[PDB]
């Protein structure tokens, strides 16, 4: 009947931005992205389980859980926090929920430790060797 022009523009911009950052990744950065995709799916299973048991309504709770996982942190914690934002995004499809998704992402990327680049480099190369 009538389309949500905002959602359509969102879908388009999201994809175009993804393909842009992916085309400008380094060879091993691309190997890391695939590594993060597998590990993220490995934890997405029980991560989904905990949130289903919440049975809850706002972006306040998600923001705290992410920063909680990043307070001495580890690659596993950083991955779980990453996959959490992705799941909030899968819930926040339309309207002002999109702006909510961006702020949660901002929180994630803002509170990453300074050694994350080499912590995830080594850890995500270990994931890739075991998965091809």
């Amino acid at each position: 009947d009538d389309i949500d022009a905002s959602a359509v523009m969102a879908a388009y911009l999201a994809r175009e931005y993804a393909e842009a950052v992916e085309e400008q990744l380094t060879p091993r950065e691309r190997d890391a992205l695939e590594a993060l995709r597998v590990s993220g799916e490995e934890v997405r299973s029980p991560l989904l389980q905990e949130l289903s048991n919440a049975g809850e309504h706002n972006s306040h709770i998600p923001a705290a859980l992410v920063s909680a996982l990043l307070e001495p942190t580890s690659p596993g914690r950083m991955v779980t926090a990453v996959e959490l934002c992705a799941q909030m995004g899968r819930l926040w499809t339309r309207g002002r929920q999109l702006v909510d998704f961006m702020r949660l992402v901002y929180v994630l990327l803002d509170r990453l430790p300074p050694t994350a680049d080499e912590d995830l480099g080594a850890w995500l190369q270990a994931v890739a060797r075991v998965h091809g």
């Binding site: 934890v43 705290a64 859980l65 690659p75 596993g76 779980t80």
Partner: peptide, 23 residues
């Protein structure tokens, strides 16, 4: 209840972290 989940999320992550630090 938030840290009940909060504690469980840290549980997952360390299980996840444990598998690939050995490798």
């Amino acid at each position: 209840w938030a840290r009940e989940i909060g504690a469980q999320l840290r549980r997952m992550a360390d299980d996840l972290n444990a598998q690939y630090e050995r490798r």
